[PDB]
Ligand SMILES: *C(=O)CCCCCCCCCCCCC
């Protein structure tokens with residue numbers, strides 16, 4: 001049941017992907033650590049909530 | 063996700079490559095130990111920084 | 125066994 | 130599994 | 135599919151302009 | 167085959183130099 | 199049992215650690231999520247939303263609705279600044295409390311491009327051309343249109359498109375700037391000027407306000423999480 | 434949980450240990466490297482660079498620019514030494530502060546071949562032949578050319594190639610020598626002599642300097658890292 | 669250079685295109701087209717004055 | 729070459745300027761890296777750079793200094809030495825950011841009857857020591873930046889005792905390379921030696937070196953040129969000989985970011 005994932009390697013030694021291993025010891029998900037394998041979304045629902053889609057090169061009002 | 067590498071064996075017992083095992087427990091590379099699997103380079107950029115490549119048997123000046 | 129990612 | 134070296 | 139640790143967008147090279155396209159002009163009244 | 171009214175040689179583009187070739191140095195003693 | 203050996207770090211409590219721990223309520227029937235509108239995945243999404251700048255923090259206008267209004271008028275052309283602003287998004291008093299400034303105060307380092315949008319709130323009968331400038335750091339801060347002209351700038355013509363956006367491009371020596379006032383990581387100067395002048399007809403108000411907004415461009419990021427000075431608890 | 438048993442070494446802090454530990458700044462956006470010129474991978478690269486020897490540490494020349502200059506002259510041939518030097522690269526006062534000597538003082542053991550290069554800084558009109566010698570340890574240290582002649586030596590003729598290199602070959606009983614003065618691991622004697630004499634014409638300076646440099650050959654290595662006596666901190 | 673073989677020296681030969689103050693000091697001459705001539709076995713040095721003109725032909 | 733070519737004879741041409749030499753001792757490329765422009769992968773300011781090319785990447789000759797038996801040594805900082813040099817200087821002061829490499833050509837001729845050897849060193853980040861034993865890191869920008877004129881080394885550390893009006897300048901002791909390290913080891917820095925019996929000159933090609941891809945040229949010097957007499961000047965029998973040292977430097981592959989109004993520094 002081991003989970004193996006990639007580390008995003010910052011400062012490299014003078015020493016190819018580096019991995020780390022994770023095993024969950026408990027039945028309840030709440031006991032689990034934070035994965036940090038998170039997603040990003042587009043800001044549109046906040047930055048552009050207008051009914052008619054905007055084209056930046058075009059006049060906002062027309 | 064286990065990493066297995068060779069030990070350079072110095073003093074041998076009266077007892078074939080010997081190995082050691084490494085597993086990374088953390089997501090951040092900074093948490094990792096030092097591999098010590100390092101490379102060597104040629105000293106030329108310091109010892110011979112001259113534009114025209116030198117031949118040691120030849121006259122340095124000509 | 126090993127679930128890789 | 131085992132990444133050997 | 136965009137991961138949090140993915141790099142942000144590259145800056146693309148841009149040249150001079152003499153156009154009817156007006157990116158700099160807008161109307162914040164719209165809410166955007 | 168070079169006619170009197172032919173155009174003179176074009177100037178070719180030239181870049182920086184760090185060389186052992188020495189065009190600027192010479193010896194007029196030779197007669198040239 | 200298995201021969202083990204304790205390393206340094208044993209039994210410490212790092213508040214930034216990430217470990218499993220026993221659950222105090224096993225087999226608890228969790229309420230499922232529903233699809234609530236407005237989910238956020240990253241704090242930088244909020245920094246990309248335009249927020250209004252308190253430009254006029256003068257002794258009588260600060261901490262009132264008035265601090266947001268930059269007054270303009272139909273007066274003759276001058277080369278003197280309408281407003282002057284240091285590009286210090288987390289520490290300059292006018293930027294530090296904007297949504298961008300507030301998120302920046304939870305982090306030690308910022309990087310990326312910013313954009314300033316101005317809204318003309320005068321009558322439709324009012325016309326005018328303004329110059330919005332950005333000078334990268336290292337010279338005399340611009341106090342006259344002639345010096346501001348020489349840096350990054352937009353000449354805004356007032357008309358049906360009410361608003362104008364100047365992008366402040368990421369121009370820095372360091373890969374990241376600090377979220378405090380520091381000369382080594384100074385960002386430069388924003389200043390606004392009259393290019394021609396505001397012209398109104400008769401029966402029209404000769405004075406009007408413009409409002410300004412700041413937000414981050416998509417190349418903007420922050421790092422090294424820290425505590426803010428913008429909230430506290432004496433006792 | 435899993436039956437474990439603590440071994441000796443548990444909870445100790447070895448300053449030379451190599452273990453993983455929790456990161457205090459998770460998910461920090463690291464600045465990438467750029468290709469900076471001059472990267473070094475091993476301290477021995479620096480030991481292979483020629484560095485100038487303070488040969489003349491006499492009471493009035495030491496700790497001045499003068500300590501680097503070995504004075505020669507057009508005087509009649511003598512069999513007496515120009516200079517005498519013990520091969521103790523980390524502990525002899527003339528070698529111990531050179532880049533080689535300095536790296537050697539961070540280690541307990543050294544091994545390998547060394548090379549000494551001499552530069553004649555006299556006029557072009559000056560001629561001369563010199564003998565550069567190396568005597569392995571165990572006999573009377575050479576005080577006359579006749580004894581120096583019998584060991585490893587180079588007869589240097591001064592001319593357009595300004596400089597001459599003598600290689601001191603690794604000749605030792607032990608596999609490694611110590612970085613301190615110790616008779617058991619003594620390395621021998623370097624000495625320089627006039628083979629003929631320096632000859633100048635008229636209108637030429639009759640006195641001149643030679644400079645000397647030391648560096649390590651590619652078969653040179655050091656081991657057992659230690660603290661140096663060449664820096665300290667009283668209080 | 670018609671001096672003895674024992675004589676050494678470095679000279680700067682300059683060409684300044686028209687329009688500014690005529691160079692009276694090395695510092696101004698340095699800024700235009702120039703050759704730094706080192707005296708040695710090649711006795712002579714050539715500076716080329718490149719055709720830099722506004723008109724297609726100059727007058728005599 | 730059998731057809732005459734040699735390591736002693738060189739011709740360098742940059743822009744409208746050419747240097748010739750008949751007595752060189754080859755030339756050094758610092759750390760084996762030739763100057764290059766900033767790559768897109770290492771880029772950081774997003775604005776279109778200014779690249780002056782031939783208008784700035786050409787040979788500028790700084791004021792000639794004089795080598796005598798009393799001479800302890802000379803130093804210069806880059807880009808500072810070139811701050812007033814034609815269009816390079818102008819481009820430098822109009823932009824917040826700038827980077828540049830350099831060809832350094834040190835000139836010193838004498839005669840077959842003279843002696844002496846100059847060590848010419850190119851030091852990355854040449855931080856020099858100040859004149860005070862009561863306060864530290866306190867050398868004024870004006871004193872730290874001599875421009876073309878450069879500065880000199882001293883054989884003796886002599887501390888500024890005027891606590892009320894501190895001199896606020898460097899006091900660079902020669903055998904300590906003006907920074908607390910021994911001169912005999914300065915050879916780990918890119919260098920050449922002008923030994924008068926061997927060569928009239930030294931030529932060093934310097935890459936842009938920094939911990940950043942581009943920086944403030946006005947706030948920060950990247951390279952220091954240090955010239956010190958390893959072997960003192962001597963001639964025939966004259967008690968007081970003199971020979972000139974001329975320094976000629978060319979910016980190479982320089983580019984500038986962050987254009988605005990010109991920087992007018994307080995240099996006095
Ligand atoms: C999947 O996990 C199969 C491989 C298991 C490898 C050994 C796991 C280490 C011990 C975990 C014990 C269980 C925790 C309660």
Ligand SMILES: *C(=O)CCCCCCCCCCCCC
Pocket residue numbers: 002004021022023063064085086087088126130131
């Ligand atoms: C690759 O690692 C697959 C095999 C895993 C073998 C057992 C690992 C031992 C327990 C590690 C637990 C995870 C650390 C957080």
